[PDB]
Amino acid sequence: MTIVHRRLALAIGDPHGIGPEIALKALQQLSATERSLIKVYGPWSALEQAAQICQMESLLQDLIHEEAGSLAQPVQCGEITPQAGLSTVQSATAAIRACESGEVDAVIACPHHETAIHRAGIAFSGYPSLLANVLGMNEDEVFLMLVGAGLRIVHVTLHESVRSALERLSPQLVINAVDAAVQTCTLLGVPKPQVAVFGINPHASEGQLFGLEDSQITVPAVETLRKRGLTVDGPMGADMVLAQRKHDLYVAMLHDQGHIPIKLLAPNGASALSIGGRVVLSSVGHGSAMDIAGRGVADATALLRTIALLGAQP
């Protein structure tokens, strides 16, 4: 019934795509008390346009809003323009900053269009990087947690070569990913999670038979994490421990270790959470759908599912 139990920022994404419309459709479905917890970031001109189209002008007067990503000309639904790409980033940047300052507790970003952003002369390799940028952090102090089909898997390393990942793996890096993910677990509604840590090597090195990495890295980190009062198993072979399915958080050492389970078990309904400082940012799982922008075809299911996940009750 009630799916929003905390303050959230909602950036409307590309103002020429379906973002604005699906924002309105989602808010419409919430209670009045729930809407008052969602602050919207984006050009008012685009919410106005979407509202006239969907016939939801009734809803704007009940809407908490902050102008961001203002445009210099009227909205053009369906069109890829540099100005809409700038709007996209400006709005998401405004939402993130509201989270960094503590006005809200998490952020959702409606769909962006990669080309739009690029044609504005702005570098963009996904939400993990953007968040790193806006917060003043190295990209490897922001972690990606995938959530899908009961699995939550945080990744200690992400988009780099296996060798490069192995060379950067330290006890401290593992610890950071876990504390970041555990804090994120509180938000998702699991205050005291059971955590499993993957081995770097097959069979978590099987003592030291298959390498020293786990002795040096995952084993020390698990002991440090227990001393701080965390319920932690491992390191264990990622295959073996994942299969048992008795943990609320798995910790993956390498991209593929976490990405394979999630995409196999949840090809259609997974969330990608970028975590950094206090900020948890999740997309919706779909594109901006330029061809149907303004045409009343896109429903807000995926956004509502993201809101529900980030807005869970303690």
Added chain:
Amino acid sequence: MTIVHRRLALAIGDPHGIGPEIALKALQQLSATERSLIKVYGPWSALEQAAQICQMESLLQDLIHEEAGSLAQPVQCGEITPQAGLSTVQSATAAIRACESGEVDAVIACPHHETAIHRAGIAFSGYPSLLANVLGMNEDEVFLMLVGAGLRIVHVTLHESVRSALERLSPQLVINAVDAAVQTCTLLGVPKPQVAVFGINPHASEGQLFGLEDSQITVPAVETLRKRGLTVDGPMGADMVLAQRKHDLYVAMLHDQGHIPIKLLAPNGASALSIGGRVVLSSVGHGSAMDIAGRGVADATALLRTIALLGAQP
């Protein structure tokens, strides 16, 4: 309901464990015609013991058998003894040799006890090594293919550290794994399979953005394999390609890339195939269960499932 469509060798494993028992229980379940296609390798003294226990002396006279791993003293159920470890290897070695010479078309090995084998002074790091040894092959020509829930995944590297795996990965090594696995696919009943190759790095390096390894190793190997008239896709991100579920054989670069999907989708029903030369050897998916040996309560389902897989029709 006929599951055996070719000649097989069945090595009964540790004669003190549940191997002999589960051999008898599985053969019992077959037709008379089917039993005549399964040649049994092991000490007769242990099949005698198991038959009295399971009340299947009726079955022995209709059994194709070759003495191998004879004992010098009576069988002792439940006991870990060096002589039982030697028996184990001798009998599996006898079955493999029947496959190399072409008396049979594949081998199944009932459970071994690793300690027993070790106490006999015999080096043993799993079936891949044994088979390399007996056949006169380098250990890096012998590959493990996991089969479970429709997925067939051969591994280019296996039980070693990630670094060590990356350091030996070459175009030629990938090629060998594929040709070994393709030949094995014929046996399993997929004569001309569609092959997908995993990337070494996330997103198969995304060109060269996440490392050089894929451009040096998987990309050249896929081209060499196509020119020889094989239907091969990739390299692709293991997550992405696995998710499409439109290939008869996946090629994993690293242990975990293949072991995670299999143990997630099939925590019981996974078979492990050691491939070398023309010889395909599969374990049963469980240990020798010394605690229950002689008690007559061991389930032959896993063995029957292995027989069905290796005895497939086409």
